[PDB]
């Protein structure tokens, strides 16, 4: 749709920051589309990833970090609030101890900080979605 | 780039048909981009897939068919002629007994027919690539 995918935005995060993403899968769930959201330590795509959030629509979600080039301990969830063929609203909130992921207003995943969120310099949203809204909030000290 | 992705084209295939695809991955191999090519029995995206060809760039290729809604026997290859960061040329030729997949001119995969190629009505090319060329040949009887 309107925002380019892959979508890259320079970003800073700290406690109280919220990343809001509105989009739609590009395929029916039977065809197994994916969504990926990566919080990077540099603007370069090969940089470390403080928070990796990857949705296999209709199947599972995997979360991880990539530290000094290497993937760490994978967290796998079978929670699937995303609905086949529907637009979704994703909210990722930076809490003192973890990221909290809301899907269509419902708390759906959390991921404890492995690297301080202040290390983030960039957010990338990609794979099989169209994007109509992307926002990072900057209201807190 | 120039062709829209996901890319869908109505198509017919028989012995001697060649499907030629030129494109580039949208991410470095470290970020594990994908490429998928599906030969469908109808224009509808949920239709059966006579040949499913899915490249996890830098990792593996999986091939399968989806018959009456259900995936059949997966074939997994670790052959990886695709080069990190490079444009690729993919050629899929319909032989009497199998599809033959050429990558940058080199024979790289084959897949025996499970459903007659005459059942194909549509080709879809999608996942994390840009596309500059797509052609189906129609020169043979």
UniProtKB/Swiss-Prot annotation, chains A, B:
CDD domains reported for this sequence: GLECT
An MF annotation (GO) of this entry: identical protein binding
Cell location: Cytoplasm, Cytosol; Cytoplasmic granule
InterPro entries found in the cross-reference section: ConA-like_dom_sf, Galectin-like, Galectin_CRD
N-acetylserine modifications at: 1
The keyword Transmembrane is assigned to this record: no
A Pfam family recorded for this sequence: Gal-bind_lectin
Marked site: Not glycosylated: 135
Gene Ontology cellular component list: collagen-containing extracellular matrix; cytosol
Source species, domain of life: Eukaryota
Subunit structure: Interacts with CEL.
Name assigned to this protein: Galectin-10
Other remarks in the entry: Forms hexagonal bipyramidal crystals, known as Charcot-Leyden crystals, in tissues and secretions from sites of eosinophil-associated inflammation and some myeloid leukemias.
Tissue specificity note: Expressed abundantly in the bone marrow. Expressed exclusively by eosinophils and basophils. Not detected in monocytes and neutrophils. Expressed in CD25-positive regulatory T-cells (Treg) (at protein level). Found in intestinal tissue from patients with Celiac disease, expression is directly related to the histological grade of mucosal damage and to the number of eosinophils found in the duodenal lesion (at protein level). Found in sputum of patients with eosinophilic inflammatory diseases such as asthma (at protein level).
Known function: Regulates immune responses through the recognition of cell-surface glycans. Essential for the anergy and suppressive function of CD25-positive regulatory T-cells (Treg).
Residue span, Galectin domain: 5-137
Assigned keywords, A-Z: Acetylation, Cytoplasm, Lectin
Alphabetical GO biological process terms: regulation of activated T cell proliferation; regulation of T cell anergy; regulation of T cell cytokine production; T cell apoptotic process
